[PDB]
A paper describes a structure:
Proprotein convertases (PCs), including [name] and [name]/3 among nine mammalian homologues, mediate the maturation of numerous secreted substrates by proteolytic cleavage. The zymogens of the [name]-like PCs share a multidomain architecture comprising an N-terminal pro-domain, a subtilisin-like catalytic domain, and a P-domain (also called HomoB-domain). Activation of [name] is triggered by two sequential autocatalytic cleavages and subsequent release of the prodomain. In this work, we investigate the structural and functional basis of PC-activation to engineer prodomain-based PC-inhibitors.
The complementary triple mutant (77)A-R-S-A-A (M2) was also resistant to proteolysis by [name] but revealed more potent inhibition compared to M1 (Ki = 0.32 ± 0.03 nM). Indeed, we could obtain crystals of M5:[name] and M2:[name] at pH 5.9 and pH 7.0, respectively. The structures of M2:[name] and M5:[name] were refined to 2.0 Å and 2.4 Å resolution, respectively. In both complex structures, the globular part of the prodomain is bound to the western rim of the substrate binding pocket. The C-terminal residues 104-110 extend over all non-primed substrate binding pockets of [name] (S1-S6). The main difference between M2:[name] and M5:[name] is found for the secondary cleavage site loop between Lys73 and Ala83. This region was well structured in M2:[name] at pH 7.0, but no electron density was observed in M5:[name] at pH 5.9. Apparently, the secondary cleavage site loop adopts a specific conformation at pH 7.0 but gets unstructured at pH 5.9. In the isolated structure of M2 and in the complex structure with [name], we found an unusual interaction of the His72 side chain with the amide nitrogen atoms of Asn74 and His75.
Residue numbers in the entry:
A (entry chain A): 110 to 574
B (entry chain B): 29 to 110
Write the structure that this text describes.
Amino acid sequence: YQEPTDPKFPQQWYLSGVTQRDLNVKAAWAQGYTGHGIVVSILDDGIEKNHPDLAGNYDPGASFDVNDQDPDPQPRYTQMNDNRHGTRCAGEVAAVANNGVCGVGVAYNARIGGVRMLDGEVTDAVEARSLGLNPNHIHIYSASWGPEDDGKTVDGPARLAEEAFFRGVSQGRGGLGSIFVWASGNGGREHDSCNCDGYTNSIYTLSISSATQFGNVPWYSEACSSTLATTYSSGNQNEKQIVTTDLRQKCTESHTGTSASAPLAAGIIALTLEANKNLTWRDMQHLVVQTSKPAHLNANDWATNGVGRKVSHSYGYGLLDAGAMVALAQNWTTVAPQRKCIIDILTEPKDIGKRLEVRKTVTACLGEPNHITRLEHAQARLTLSYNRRGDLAIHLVSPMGTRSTLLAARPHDYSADGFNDWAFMTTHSWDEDPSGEWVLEIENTSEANNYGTLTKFTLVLYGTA
Amino acid sequence: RQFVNEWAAEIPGGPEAASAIAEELGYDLLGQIGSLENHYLFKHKNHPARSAASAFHITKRLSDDDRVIWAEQQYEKERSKR
Ligand SMILES: [Ca+2]
Ligand SMILES: [Ca+2]
Ligand SMILES: [Ca+2]
Ligand code: NA
Ligand code: NA
C-alpha cells in the first residue's frame, strides 16, 4: 500500500508524522483498513455534498435536512460562511484520498453523510430525529455541539434525545448499537466542566477531548471524569491545526477546537469497525480504554487507577491509537451483556456546609441478576441544594482508590438551583471491582460562607459479571 | 426561553391513535419523531408559534389523555458549535 498522494496530506501532521506524535493511522491503513463499508454521519450545520473531496464518498442515505425538512443537507451559504462547520468535520472523517485535492480523511474509503440540524431552531425533537436517522444504515454519528460552554450552564439531552440515545445503542446497527462520538467542549477559558454537559457526560457517547501538537492541554479544553480519550486539535499560534474540507469547495488548514477532535475519533472508529463489524457499542469503548496512549500527553493530573491504567480528566485514557485499535479489534471477544446496578446511598439528607464526606460499602447488587464484578461506567446521581453552585467541587473515590473529580469549581456559576438528580459520570474506574467502600466528597472551595444539603445520592454501576 | 407550539407525545396505540388525538384535541399531526416508534410530534392549530410563556393547560390536556403516556411542549434550546 502507498500512503496518500494528496497535496495537503503532509500538513496533516496528526495522521502521518515523522516524530511519533500522531494518531498511528498509517499503521491502520497499512493493515488494509480505510473505512470501506462503514457509514458515518455528521450532525451539524450541513455538509457540502458536492465538495471535490467529499462527493466521491457522499451518501444521501446517511443524510437529511431537519431544519428545513428536506432530504438535502446542503449548507446555507452566507457572506460570513456561518455554515462551514459540518463540512470541515466531514472532511476529517472521509475526505477522498489520492485525488489531488486538499488532504485525506482518516477513513477515506468510508461513506459520509450530514444531518443539517443546527442551522435553525433546535428542539428536543430536532435532536432526537438527528440522533436516530437511519440507525440500521448509519454506523457512527459525530456531533461537535452541545450546551453553552459559558461555565454557568447545566444541561443535557431532554426526554426525546435521551430516548434516541438509548434506542440507538440497544437497537441500532441490527442490535449492536449506534456509535455516538461527541466533543467534550470548548469552555476551558470559562473553567467549564464537561460533566455539566449531559451529552458528553452520557454513557452512550464516546466523549473525546483535545491535545495540542506539542502535547499540551489547549486553552479551550474542559476537564471532567466522563471523557474517554483524546485526539489532536489546535493550540497556540506556533502549533499546527486541522487540515480538512471547507465551504465553497475549498481547503482549510485552520480547523480548531474540540469539534476537530471528535471527527478524527469517528474516523479511527470507522477503521476499527471495518476491522471487526460485529463490535458492539460497548465493545468499541472497551477498545478505546485498552489501546489509548497517555505517553505523549502532558497533564497535571495523571493518576493510575485500580487496574493499572493512567487516566487524566483532561484526556481520559490518552491519545487514540488507530493501529492498536484495529489490531485489538480483529480477535476481540464481544463483552457480556450490560448490567446496571442502582444503589441508594443516603438514608436521610446530609448537610454540606464547608465539607461533606459520604462513605458506603456496597455489594454491587450481589445475589441479583444485575450483579456486577467488573465495572464499566459509574454515575453519582446527585440531588442537592446550594446557594452558590460554582463554589462546589465533588469527588468520587472507588473501592480500589481511584479518585474521580465529578465537578470542579466553576467561578462563573452563581446559580442557586443546585443539582436535580444530575448524573455525574466517570470512566476512570473502568474494569475495576465495584464492591467495597465508595466515598463521595463535596467541598466548598471558596472562603465565603456557603450552605446547602445533599438530599439524594444514587450510585449507578454499569458493567458485567 | 422561547416555547414553540409543538408537542411531543408517546402514544402506544400507533399512528391511528395519534391521528385521532390530533383531530380531537386540535393539532396537526406532523408525524413520527425519527426512529422512535410511538413517539409523535404535533403542532397546535391556534396557539402562537413562539412565546416566552409555556402553554401549561394545552400540555395537561394532551398528557392527561388515556392514549398518551407522556407529553411535553417543545422549546428552542441554546446549542453551540465547538
Ligand atoms: Ca435542504
Ligand atoms: Ca483528497
Ligand atoms: Ca461545556
Ligand atoms: Na460520553
Ligand atoms: Na395519559
